[PDB]
């Protein structure tokens, strides 16, 4: 079952503010992870910003979540050995219309 491989680690916008479903990025730091720092988005409101600049509760801000690969230190504090892990992260927010029909 364990499939160990070699990995060479030496590798060769203002939307969050202008969006109708704006969001804030929060720093997530983990010394036992690669990348150590991941920026996760949190929606600013439940509604969406309307043309007059106010929150419209007839539409909703929802997070856009993607699965990403990360390297987790195995054993803990190991600088050269990791386990591949898949985590879910929020990238930003989109504005959705609720279903009002059959």
């Amino acid at each position, epitope marked *: 079952f364990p499939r160990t491989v070699m990995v060479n680690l030496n590798i060769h916008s203002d939307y969050y503010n202008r969006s109708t479903s704006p969001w*804030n990025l929060h720093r997530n730091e983990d010394p036992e992870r690669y990348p150590s720092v991941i920026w*996760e*988005a*949190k*929606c*600013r*409101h*439940l*509604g969406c910003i309307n043309a007059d600049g106010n929150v419209d*509760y*007839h*539409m*909703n801000s*929802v*997070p856009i*979540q993607q699965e990403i690969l990360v390297l987790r230190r195995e054993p803990p504090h190991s600088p050269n050995s990791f386990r591949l892990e898949k985590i*879910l992260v*929020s990238v930003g927010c989109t504005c*959705v219309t*609720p*279903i*009002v*029909h*059959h």
Partner: antibody, heavy 125, light 108 residues
Framework: EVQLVESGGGLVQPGGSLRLSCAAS????????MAWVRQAPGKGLEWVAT????????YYRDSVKGRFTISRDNAKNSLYLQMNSLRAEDTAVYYC??????????????????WGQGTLVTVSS | AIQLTQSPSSLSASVGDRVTITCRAD??????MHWYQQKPGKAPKLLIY???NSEIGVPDRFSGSGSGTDFRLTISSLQPEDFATYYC?????????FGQGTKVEIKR
């Protein structure tokens, strides 16, 4: 994985006191408002109390106002419910519930994305 | 203060049936309506948030719809594991209230 673990529920005589505790893990506890929701045996869900992320504001169900106190210790990642002057209406399973993590904790009107296992409080002589 | 009424209070349906539960609020909650599934002897689990959004891991057969005062949770093809009590909840105004619940049983 978010985990909420409750304890403290037990038999308490009418007019007595009990303190419920909820240990949180898997998220930044100090970033979110926390709540207690109860369910009387064979009945529906009923919101009991809410406390803001840094304990500065508390909100209660009318029937428990003055009798219950919601508190938190962000350093110990735990939520508390001090229950005094216990009555028959207070016999219920008490759950601690937390909001979704992909929304700002400053949004008061968030739903309960995560719940503890529940702790049973029985008010009886 | 905002009262939520679910209909029906209980129902029985065969595996494969389309099941519909309604939730009516006495005043508008706009889109701050959510649904929970509670299995016997277990804590409630969030199914739908903000009228129509399923949380990750919730099967495709569950969908929510509605507006203002009338909301609906639909299970498109009932499965044996869907035996549970479903509750609607409004977070529009204090105090946050829940519907009385709808018990869903399987006909076999």
């Amino acid at each position: 994985e978010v985990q909420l673990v409750e304890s403290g529920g037990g038999l308490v005589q009418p007019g007595g006191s009990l303190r419920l505790s909820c240990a949180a893990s898997g998220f930044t506890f100090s970033d979110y408002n926390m709540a207690w929701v109860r369910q009387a045996p064979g009945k529906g869900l009923e919101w009991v109390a809410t406390i803001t992320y840094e304990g500065r504001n508390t909100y209660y169900r009318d029937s428990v106002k003055g009798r219950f106190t919601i508190s938190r210790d962000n350093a110990k990642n735990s939520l508390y419910l001090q229950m005094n002057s216990l009555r028959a209406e207070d016999t219920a399973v008490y759950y601690c519930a937390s909001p979704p993590q992909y929304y700002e904790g400053s949004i008061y009107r968030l739903w309960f994305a995560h719940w503890g296992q529940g702790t049973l409080v029985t008010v009886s002589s | 203060a905002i009262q939520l009424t679910q209909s029906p209070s209980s129902l029985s349906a065969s595996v494969g049936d389309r099941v519909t539960i309604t939730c009516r609020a006495d005043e508008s909650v706009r889109t701050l309506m959510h649904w929970y599934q509670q299995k016997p002897g277990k804590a409630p689990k969030l199914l739908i948030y903000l009228v129509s959004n399923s949380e990750i891991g919730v099967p495709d057969r569950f969908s929510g719809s509605g507006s203002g005062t009338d909301f609906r949770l639909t299970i498109s093809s009932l499965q044996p594991e869907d035996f549970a009590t479903y509750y609607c909840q409004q977070t529009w105004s204090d105090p946050w209230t829940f519907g009385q619940g709808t018990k869903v049983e399987i006909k076999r």
